[PDB]
């Protein structure tokens, strides 16, 4: 086993080195607000590394985008909101707007960098 694989938005918790084989285990951590998916630990055996984990993306919610949807955050932290993978976010329609037909909720969940923005139409 040579050097452990790289993962996006993460890194091994230890100072890398070029000679491992075998039995060796390295651990990964993700960047702030990213969510580790898979076993934190990878191991060396038979020359190959066992599959490393991956870092599920958070979502960053901006007024810039929300404005296109005539929407705002319910618990008004900005303007800007970071939400981790798995966490739901609660919007309101902005003054003078209603949920709109093709939209089912003002509360949606972030998945690996994807969040549905509810549409609001205007009465």
């Amino acid at each position: 086993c040579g050097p452990p694989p790289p993962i996006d938005n993460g890194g091994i918790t230890s100072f890398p080195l070029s000679v491992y084989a075998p039995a060796s285990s390295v651990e990964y951590q993700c960047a702030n607000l990213y969510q580790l998916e898979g076993n934190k630990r990878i191991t060396c055996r038979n020359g190959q590394w066992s599959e490393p984990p991956k870092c599920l993306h958070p979502c960053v919610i901006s007024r810039e985008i929300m404005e296109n949807y005539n929407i705002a955050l319910r618990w008004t932290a900005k303007q800007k909101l970071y939400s981790r993978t798995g966490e739901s976010v609660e919007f309101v329609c902005k003054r003078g707007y209603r949920l709109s037909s093709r939209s089912h909720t003002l509360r949606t969940t972030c998945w690996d960098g994807k969040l549905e923005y509810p549409t609001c139409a205007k009465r």
Partner: protein, 294 residues
């Protein structure tokens, strides 16, 4: 070129805890840097170089006592880690590796902590435990437009450490880009001359200082020789040094002469309470100028 003889005082022995040790380390490191690049060791006394080096080694060694297991730094081992200080250590060590033997693990470990712990998803860096010595952070002390200024400061540190750490820290290039993203998206709303200077150097380093942005950076200079704001004049020395380094990046050699002259006109020689950023920055830029003579 600031005459060697006017710099004898920048050679100091470092002391104190996690912040003060860096305050003393700074002048000596940047002084050896400037003297090397300007080739004034004859006018200064070559035999003095070795002694300065020993002082720098001493600074580096006692700084390691404030390295936390996470690889971050603070004034004291059990004070919450400072984003700013950790980046500042990266900035100094990343220069000092050329003067003395610095352990890559210490430097790149600080880099990985910054990246994996303190950068936000949109690329901004956040300070969660401000330094005690608010006088060592230069124009950042003015607390407003802080995301952009802190993000710029850290990004520059990261760019400084890139060639040294990219190997041990895979996430480095992506971190740099994402911070570049944030500075770019908001560079036009910048008001303070200080920020346009420091963010401008950060973007220029990447090649993202262009079009309207380039124009805005160039047209913030008063009299086309300095970047300044009302308030503490060290900030203006510092900011204008950032711009000099940015302009030097753009190869805009036809703009630098005034700026270089205004800086030399300041007759500023660094050192003293509150002089940390201005001292490091003034001598780094002019050093850069002297090696960039076409």
């Amino acid at each position: 070129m600031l005459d060697a003889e006017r710099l004898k005082h920048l050679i100091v022995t470092p002391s104190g805890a996690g912040e003060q040790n860096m305050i003393g380390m700074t002048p000596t490191v940047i002084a050896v840097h400037y003297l090397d690049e300007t080739e004034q060791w004859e006018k200064f006394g070559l035999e003095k170089r070795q002694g300065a080096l020993e002082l720098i080694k001493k600074g580096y060694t006692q700084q390691l006592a404030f390295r936390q297991p996470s690889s971050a730094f603070a004034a004291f081992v059990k004070r919450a880690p400072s984003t700013w200080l950790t980046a500042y250590v990266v900035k100094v060590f990343s220069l000092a590796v050329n003067l003395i033997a610095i352990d890559s693990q210490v430097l790149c470990g600080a880099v990985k902590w910054l990246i994996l712990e303190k950068q936000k998803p949109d690329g901004v860096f956040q300070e969660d435990a401000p330094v005690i010595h608010q006088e060592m952070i230069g124009g950042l002390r003015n607390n407003n437009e802080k995301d952009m200024a802190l993000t710029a400061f850290v990004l520059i540190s990261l760019q400084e450490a890139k060639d040294i750490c990219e190997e041990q820290v895979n996430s480095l290039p992506g971190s740099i880009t994402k911070a570049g993203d944030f500075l770019e998206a908001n560079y036009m709303n910048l008001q303070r001359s200080y920020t346009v200077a420091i963010a401008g150097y950060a973007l220029a380093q990447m090649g993202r200082l262009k079009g309207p942005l380039l124009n805005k950076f160039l047209t913030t200079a008063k009299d086309k020789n300095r970047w300044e704001d009302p308030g503490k004049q060290l900030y203006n020395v510092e900011a204008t040094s950032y711009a000099l380094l940015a302009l030097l990046q753009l190869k805009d050699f036809d703009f630098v002469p005034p700026v270089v002259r205004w800086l030399n006109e300041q007759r500023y020689y660094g050192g003293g309470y509150g002089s940390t950023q201005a001292t490091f920055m003034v001598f780094q830029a002019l050093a850069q100028y002297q090696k960039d003579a076409p």
